[PDB]
From a paper:
In Gram-positive bacteria, nitrogen homeostasis is controlled by an operon encoding [name] (GS), a dodecameric machine that assimilates ammonium into glutamine, and the [name] repressor. [name] detects nitrogen excess indirectly by binding glutamine-feedback-inhibited-GS (FBI-GS), which activates its transcription-repression function. GS generates glutamine from glutamate, ATP, and ammonium by a mechanism that involves the initial phosphorylation of the γ-carboxyl group of glutamate by ATP and the subsequent incorporation of ammonium.
F Density for [name] peptide and contacts with GS in the Lm FBI-GS-[name] complex (map contoured at 0.55 σ). Peptide density was evident for 8-10 residues of the [name] C-tails from Pp (IQGELSRF), Sa (PINRGDLSRF), and Bs (FRQGDMSRF), and 5 [name] C-terminal residues (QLPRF), in the Lm complex. These [name] C-tails all form a distorted helix and bind within the GS active sites. The corresponding residue in Lm [name] is glutamine and the density corresponding to this N-terminal [name] peptide region in the Lm structure is poorly resolved. The SRF motif is the most conserved region of the [name] C-tails. In the Lm structure this arginine contacts an α14´ acidic residue. In this regard, it is interesting to note that while the Lm [name] peptide binds with lower affinity to its FBI-GS, the most ordered part of its C-tail is its SRF motif, which makes contacts to α14´ and α15´´.
Residue numbers in the entry:
A (entry chain K), B (entry chain J), C (entry chain Z): 6 to 10
D (entry chain Q): 213 to 444
E (entry chain A), F (entry chain F): 2 to 444
The structure:
Amino acid sequence: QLPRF
Amino acid sequence: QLPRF
Amino acid sequence: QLPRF
Amino acid sequence: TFKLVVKTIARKHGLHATFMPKPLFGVNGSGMHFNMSLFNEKGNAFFDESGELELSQTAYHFLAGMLKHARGYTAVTNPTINSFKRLVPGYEAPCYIAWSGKNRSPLVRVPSSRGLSTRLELRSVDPSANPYLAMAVLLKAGLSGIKDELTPPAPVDRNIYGMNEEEREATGIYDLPESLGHALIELEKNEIIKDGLGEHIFEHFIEAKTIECDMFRTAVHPWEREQYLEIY
Amino acid sequence: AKYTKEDIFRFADEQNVKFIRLQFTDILGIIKNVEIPVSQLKKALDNKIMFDGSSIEGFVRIEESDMYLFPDLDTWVVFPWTAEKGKVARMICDIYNPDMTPFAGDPRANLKRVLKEMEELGFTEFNLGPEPEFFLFKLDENRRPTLELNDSGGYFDLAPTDLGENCRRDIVLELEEMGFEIEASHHEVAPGQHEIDFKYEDAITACDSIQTFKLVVKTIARKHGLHATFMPKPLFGVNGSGMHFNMSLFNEKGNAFFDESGELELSQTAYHFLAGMLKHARGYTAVTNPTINSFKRLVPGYEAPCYIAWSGKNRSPLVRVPSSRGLSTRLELRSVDPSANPYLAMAVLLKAGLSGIKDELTPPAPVDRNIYGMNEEEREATGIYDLPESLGHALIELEKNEIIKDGLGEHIFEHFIEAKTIECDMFRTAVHPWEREQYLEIY
Amino acid sequence: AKYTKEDIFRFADEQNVKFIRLQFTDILGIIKNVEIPVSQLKKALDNKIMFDGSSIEGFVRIEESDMYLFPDLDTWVVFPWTAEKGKVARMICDIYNPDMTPFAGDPRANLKRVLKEMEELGFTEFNLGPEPEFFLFKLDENRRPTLELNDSGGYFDLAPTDLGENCRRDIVLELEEMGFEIEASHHEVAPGQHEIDFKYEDAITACDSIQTFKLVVKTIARKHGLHATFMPKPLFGVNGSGMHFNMSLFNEKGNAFFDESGELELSQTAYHFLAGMLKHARGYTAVTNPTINSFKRLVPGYEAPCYIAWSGKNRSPLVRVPSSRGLSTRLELRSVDPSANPYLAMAVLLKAGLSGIKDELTPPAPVDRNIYGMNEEEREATGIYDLPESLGHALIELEKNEIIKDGLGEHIFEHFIEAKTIECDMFRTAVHPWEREQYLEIY
Ligand SMILES: NC(=O)CC[C@H](N)C(=O)O
Ligand SMILES: NC(=O)CC[C@H](N)C(=O)O
Ligand SMILES: NC(=O)CC[C@H](N)C(=O)O
Ligand SMILES: [Mg+2]
Ligand SMILES: [Mg+2]
Ligand SMILES: [Mg+2]
Ligand SMILES: [Mg+2]
Ligand SMILES: [Mg+2]
């Protein structure tokens, strides 16, 4: 869901 | 127009 | 007279 | 395939090939101008020897559709934060919603070639965009313009950059979104672009781009330190 | 017609070329080109290639304009330094409007128009022989040019000698191999300065040969770890680089400048051409010397011209008449430098000479008394006048003269004036290390 | 009369001075001096010291000429940085011919002559307040100036702060100790640029204070490992250094520029002075800006004047009228730079104002519409004209104007033109690294 963050 | 400047 | 040049 | 091959070959010769819209400040950006033409059974649908500018009514409807929803699909055609750094005046990148045959950085340009080579050029697209999504949204906008038979605005050739924002907002000239967040808002407002993208793609694209915008907004850049660490 | 389409296709097939550089020259004189694979060659020969014509305007371009790329078949040249992964060939191309009309802003098209006017007046051809001079500098570790010359030679000296090096010999050998008509080659007055002379061809062919010569010389010098520069005055206190033009006008009978029964064995046409060239010299000085560095060369004591006068034998005259006669009768203009655009310079010179012929002007008497002997006031009484001392004054003289404007065309004149005024403004507001060395400590 | 001979002898005895620098100013503005032991002081006070007057002519001197060295008693100043092996004192001296007549080639004598003319017309004194600006650069290991500024300050900013350094504070403290009337001191727009303001004194006293201020600032900056420069434009793209002159004319009643019943509370004398100053500005621009670098400062966008106009509140006017009135009424000329000779500039400005008063010229209407908004053509229709863009044009304007020649004197005028034409030629023929970076690989 949020690997970037 | 002005890449030099 | 001209030692600058 | 061209992106992949160019990157591989540049890596072969000890180089890095980048398609970032604006890798450096104060220098020209990178664009991916699209020259599109629509064909039918007879031939080119944009060509008409008896029409004004040798352009068919289909071409004018396509122009009207492309210009009407440009604020809508600007997010899809420029999906990165770095993209809107390219859309600044003075570097030949488009900044206003207008079309012309010969002007300094128009949003849509009509090349002088005619016949089977008649086409419309959109200059706001950058290499970072997804080609499939950009083509889908552009085709949807043009198709909607054709179906609604919208009349395009008169072309501008008076160097719109000459006037201020207020002096040109009186006419039909409008500004493109200045940031990815505003473009995302415009996407969330427009319905035809949503129909052209599909619910699944629209939702996932919006989620990813909102995450990207939030990540960029809360970051602290060295620009801020160079401007305020010593002053304050 | 030296080559046809079938000849070009046969050459491309047999020499195994995979890249073609359709090249042209902008207003500023920079060689530009569009690169196409061999598979597009047929389309290139159909005059169907589109490109951005605004690049011809240089950096002062504003709006993108589509233009055609009519190539010239006779300019087909295959480069030798292309390895084995396909060869590279070039053809100089003409620029045409989308309405099948030659572009007025193209220097080559402007030269063709001026030549058409000359043919209308009654002449056949305008033969030109240039004498370009260039400097050779040693490269640094990072392949950057330095200020060190390759040799401390002399005028006509056997300085490079045998046993390797001798970049002039390699350059002339490869030029001969590429198909260039080289008359002679020698060392110039300045150390590291070399001159190579050409054979006399037509105006357009001579200009194309000049551009190709610059490109080839730069490439070959880079091959041997050297930098070849055509800057009019790279160094202070040393002789500059010139591109003397030996021009001759021909008609159906033969050389129009030759007359066995005339004074100095010169025809009345030659005298009218001299009068026209001298009358408007102050006008086209800007075109023939388009850079700021150019007017650093036009200083007394280095054989560069400084006064508007003509002679058969004098120390640095503006126009010189070589002693050769017959079919070799010609007039030499010495104010031109290698930095100038050959097409624009030829156009303005031809316009001035044609105007002189039409008006039948009487040239002033030649001077042979060493005009440098007197002061400016003592020679201003006679017809001797000074050339412009800076690019701004030359630009003003251009803006005043009308015949040179007609010979350049409105588009080229406006864009040239804009670019040169920007260049002058950029140079004027800069702060040079000379100023710091002269005032930082004193004041 | 502030001091007498006996006072000078008493000072020399009590402060234990062993060296006296009899100093003067040449045409080019360089401070020169003859050094004598204290034992010769009596002879120095007898006006019997001989020296070579040709040094006043600068580098263009030809023949040695003997001249006297009449000192000024009121200019006695003892330097503090002299250790204990005897102190050093100076007195500004007048130059006199061997026939007991003041030398016409001395700038101070010329200023005295112009002041005598002004007193003949009816006025008493010409008060002047200068606003000199200077740059501070860091020295290298070999005690050579570099291009790095001492601080990245701002306009009126508290940039140097406390806790050491603050060279401006030390400079103003030592100037106050030496006996200087300092009004204020602040940081200028450019980083590393500082301004110190003076009190309003007589013309001669103000010029002497300017010269002493330059000397003291340079010495103190060298003490703290810094280089203080008064170059008009040491760096490109940054604000230049100016020496705005606030001048006021006095009579027996009081300030001649003040009139409560006049428009803008200005007398007719002030308007005549404005008309004279504006009419001949193109004439004395050469004298007020004598270096090549000076005209690099006179460019738009850096608050330096560029057009001949006056205003009470405008972006960079040539002449500005401060809002203060009464005895503080004055006219400010902003085209002067620190490199100018104070005596020559004051002489030419006084001559222009006096001519305007005598002719009763009507000044043009003030401009407050941001003349920078229009183009050159759109403002040339009105009375707005451009200042000379180069030293050569300014020298031509000098050679045309006659009133400025009368205010300078034949000797000073001839020697100034000679020296400055050499400077122009020296700069014109030089090859700068700008050209070797714009046309090297390009051509
Ligand atoms: N010459 C051009 O039109 C280049 C356009 C520019 N590179 C862009 O990204 O839009
Ligand atoms: N010997 C010569 O004539 C050389 C002339 C000189 N090199 C020039 O540039 O004009
Ligand atoms: N703030 C100012 O007025 C500074 C003016 C500028 N330093 C000059 O030299 O003219
Ligand atoms: Mg395009
Ligand atoms: Mg030669
Ligand atoms: Mg020659
Ligand atoms: Mg100030
Ligand atoms: Mg001021």
